[PDB]
Amino acid sequence: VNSFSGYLKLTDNVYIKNADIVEEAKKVKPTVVVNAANVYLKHGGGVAGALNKATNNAMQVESDDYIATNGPLKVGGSCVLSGHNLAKHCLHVVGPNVNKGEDIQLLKSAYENFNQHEVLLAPLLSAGIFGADPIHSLRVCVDTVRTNVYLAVFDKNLYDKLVSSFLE
Ligand SMILES: Cc1cc(Br)c2c(c1)C(=O)C(=O)N2
State how far the Cα of 141 lies from the Cα of 15, in Å rounded to an integer. Answer: 11
Q: Whose CA is nearest to atom 13 of ligand 1?
A: 163
Does residue 157 have its Cβ closer than 6 Å to ligand 1? no
State how far the Cα of 138 lies from the Cα of 136, in Å rounded to an integer. Answer: 5
Q: For residue 7, give the amino acid letter.
A: Y
Per-residue DSSP letter, 86: T
State the Rg of the chain over Cα.
Answer: 15
Q: For residue 15, give the amino acid letter.
A: Y
Pairing of strands 148-153, 119-122: parallel
Ligand 1 centre from 30 Cα, in Å?
Answer: 26
Contact 35, 51 (CB under 8 A): yes
Q: How far is CA 74 from CA 68, 78, 108, in A?
A: 15, 8, 14
Q: How far is CA 45 from CA 35, 39, 93, in A?
A: 11, 14, 15
Does residue 104 have its Cβ closer than 6 Å to ligand 1? no
Does residue 12 have its Cβ closer than 6 Å to ligand 1? no
Sorted by where each begins, the domain ranges of the chain are 1-168
State how far the Cα of 126 lies from the Cα of 48, in Å rounded to an integer. Answer: 12
Nearest to 152 by CA among 47, 37, 43: 47
Q: How far is CA 142 from CA 51, 83, 151, in A?
A: 24, 24, 11
> Which ligand 1 atom sits closest to the C-alpha of 8?
12
Q: How far is CA 52 from CA 21, 74, 110, 127, in A?
A: 12, 21, 20, 18
Does residue 160 have its Cβ closer than 6 Å to ligand 1? yes
Q: How far is CA 37 from CA 6, 45, 68, 112, in A?
A: 26, 10, 16, 15
